[PDB]
Point group: C2
Chain length 170, copies 2
């Protein structure tokens, strides 16, 4: 594990840089596919995976990867931070500055993070006992990120998108 202050800071910045590059490429791949460039989209997705490898490598060097129970905990804290601190404030700020678009994206994220924090809490209770959670599939709204396990509402409670549009993980 890296211990020197400056190098740790640099690896942290590189992890953030790699994460954003990976994210942009997933976004670009989707856009390229919609524009009629399937091979360019394929290129973006592959490189996005390469950035995942870079990010994971820095992540491990910082010694931030642990066992599932500990990983779920990192998740619980991050989600909880976004629910109680970050998004409420960013949302209130956007409201205050009249940026309706930002008011919407932060509202979208916030409601979903509330669900994430809870699912991770339930999951840890299991993992911590050496047990896997019992879930068949997960629904994710492609519009606002609303998340549902096993059973989904007919329409997204946040944006109202029909269930037919939810991305399914099974």
């Amino acid at each position: 594990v890296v211990k020197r202050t400056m190098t740790k800071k640099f690896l942290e910045e590189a992890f953030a840089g790699e994460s954003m590059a990976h994210m942009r490429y997933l976004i670009f791949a989707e856009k390229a596919e919609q524009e009629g460039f399937p091979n360019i989209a394929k290129l973006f997705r592959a490189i996005a995976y390469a950035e995942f490898v870079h990010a994971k490598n820095h992540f491990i060097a910082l010694g931030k990867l642990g066992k599932t129970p500990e990983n779920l905990q990192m998740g619980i804290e991050g989600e909880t931070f976004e629910v109680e601190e970050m998004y409420p404030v960013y949302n209130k700020a956007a409201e205050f500055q009249g940026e309706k678009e930002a008011v919407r994206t932060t509202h979208y994220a916030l409601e979903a993070e509330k669900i994430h924090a809870e699912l991770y809490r339930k999951a840890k209770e299991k993992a911590e006992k050496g047990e896997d959670i019992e879930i068949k599939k997960v629904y994710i709204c492609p519009i606002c990120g609303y998340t549902a396990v096993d059973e989904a509402p007919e329409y997204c409670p946040v944006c109202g998108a029909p269930k037919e549009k939810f991305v399914v993980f099974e």
Copy 2:
């Protein structure tokens, strides 16, 4: 598109936050799989997607998504910055502080970004003319992220990984 300075800054911060959460979850998912928790891995992957939706929303709100040619340009500039500026410096600093692990992770990323920059350049020249790129498959080394198109090398020149370890994108 969001214009106010503070809200714009907050959305850029949220984009970074969502990107890193997305990444940590993809990393945690692979770990959960390796530890024997396939359902928890499923949850991590599903939620990773939800964070992609959130980041995509902020990114679009910030007005950073354009047509494929322009998106490739953003990629070219990002990769070039990492190749010419960021990684050579972080790598040198890591070496100077004797953090061998970081020397390795920054070197792995560096060699790969050099390839990425060139590939996006090639792709853009085609996209500019309304043409897709002529690539059938893309191989990615799961160890260092080394990237090769159409054919995988006998062994990864960067980390030494055998050809059979490459992840294929077709």
